[model samples]
Target: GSSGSSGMSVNMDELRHQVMINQFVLAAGCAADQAKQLLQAAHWQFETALSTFFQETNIPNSHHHH
Candidate 1:
């Protein structure tokens, strides 16, 4: 791990350039343009779009320890 790291610069570009499109479409059902668009908006973040998808409706926030 990098201890001197602050904010990643080049890695950000690398992450952006490698944004996955269909992964979300096929799995997350972002069949609509907005579906995949959400991925791009979140920089192809899996959990980001996942939370966003459910954020629309109200239910299933998180699991409890019990």
Candidate 2:
């Protein structure tokens, strides 16, 4: 990511969209479209969304307790 004149600022959502979306998606995470909504909220305040994500993620409710 060299600091230079970016050529694709035309469509604003193009950059941050693919950037974070891909990470969350490829991390074996959210669905394709759902990633956008989830990430959008995270960018607002990850603390809020993080709890929701973890809460609903693969559950270990009845597993061995620590």
**Model 1: per-residue lDDT, tens digit, 1-66?**
768967865465644433445555656666657655786777667678877775768766798898
Cα lDDT for residue 49, model 1?
Answer: 80
Residue 11 CA displacement from its true place in model 2, Å: 12
User: On a 0 to 1 TM-score scale, where does candidate 1 land against the true structure?
Assistant: 0.42
RMSD of each: 6.7, 9.5
Which residue pairs clash within candidate 2?
none
Report, for all candidates in order, the number of backbone clashes: 0, 0
Taking all chains together, each candidate's TM-score versus the true structure is 0.42, 0.42
Off by over 4 Å in 1: 1-19, 59-66
